[PDB]
Design a protein around this ligand. Sequence first.
Ligand SMILES: C1c2c(-c3nnn[nH]3)n[nH]c2[C@@H]2C[C@H]12
Length: 290
Amino acid sequence: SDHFLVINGKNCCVFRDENIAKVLPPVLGLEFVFGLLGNGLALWIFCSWKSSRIFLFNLAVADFLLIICLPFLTDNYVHNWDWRFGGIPCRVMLFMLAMNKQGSIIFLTVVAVARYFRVVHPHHFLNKISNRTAAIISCFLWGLTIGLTVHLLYTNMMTKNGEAYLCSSFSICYNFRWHDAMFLLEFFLPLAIILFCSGRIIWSLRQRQMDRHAKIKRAINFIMVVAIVFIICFLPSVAVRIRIFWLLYKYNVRNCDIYSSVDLAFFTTLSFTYMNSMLDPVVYYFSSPS
Ligand SMILES: C1c2c(-c3nnn[nH]3)n[nH]c2[C@@H]2C[C@H]12
């Protein structure tokens, strides 16, 4: 074939492997059904009384929004990278994916930091914040997410690939743009925050042994579970993308068959980033004694 293509004037090349149409819908359908059956309940009932419930409600809202748009991704895949709905629709779909993932990560980090303050600084005033301030913080964080990701709606992403129509913010292009920096940061910065907060919480707890280990162990296990779930879900795609950037820097897009494998890898790992949203209800809400 001839994979070289021009997207927004930039020289990329995109590949169309039927393995993507074969393997991904198997994972995306399960992600959709489980995300619905978990997050719809987490929203029906918060996890509204406390700030932590508010933050978890926002996390569930982001996860719900992210999963409800996964059927359109499945459609794009089963047709082997053929969008049937037009430009504005997939502009919106990609914007939703990016904004909802970023919001979910932000609220994971907010919950982690709140736990850190609750366990390490019991008598800080953050532990006694009223619901109003939680609402204002949540609104400002949502506004930050939209302000960061609205350029997707601003810009064009639909391009004609031969006999097909390809919509995608992740074409292998000799163009390092703010979207990729955001994609890397959304992992590296909140990961650092989450791991630090967790390490301090587990260090502070292990200094006190006043005969209630039965439940403190459980809490430590759940903090570790959150950290490892985040890492396993999001690190693979970032790693593949960093390999992609090394390749782009050294081997520009001229013989770009060399990207063929890595490209597939990337789109087989993005799926994991969606799967986080179906795990989160089990990690955060369903673990509580309800
Ligand atoms: C998924 C995806 C995303 C994305 N961003 N955030 N989550 N998925 N951007 N571009 C594309 C092409 C269709 C795949």
